[PDB]
Amino acid sequence: FITANSEYSESSSFKNTETEKSMYTSSRYLFPQGRIDFTTPDSGFDDV
Amino acid sequence: AHTMETFSRSENETEVKQDVKAGLEGAVKGWGGGATAGHGNTQGTITT
B17, B39 in Cβ contact below 8 A?
no
Resolution in A: 2.5
In sequence order, what are the residues at sequence separation of 6 or more whose Cβ sits closer than 8 angstroms to the Cβ of residue B48? B9, B10, B11, B12
**Of B21, B19, B12, B22, residue with least CA distance to B44:** B12
**Exposed e or buried b per residue across B1-38, where buried means at least 16 C-beta atoms within 10 angstroms of its C-beta:** eeeeeeeeeeeeeeeeeeeeeeeeeeeeeeeeeeeeee
**B48, B10 in Cβ contact below 8 A?**
yes
Q: Which residues, in sequence order, are CB contacts of A8 under 8 Å at separation 6+?
A: none
Nearest by Cα to A1 from B33, B27, B31: B31
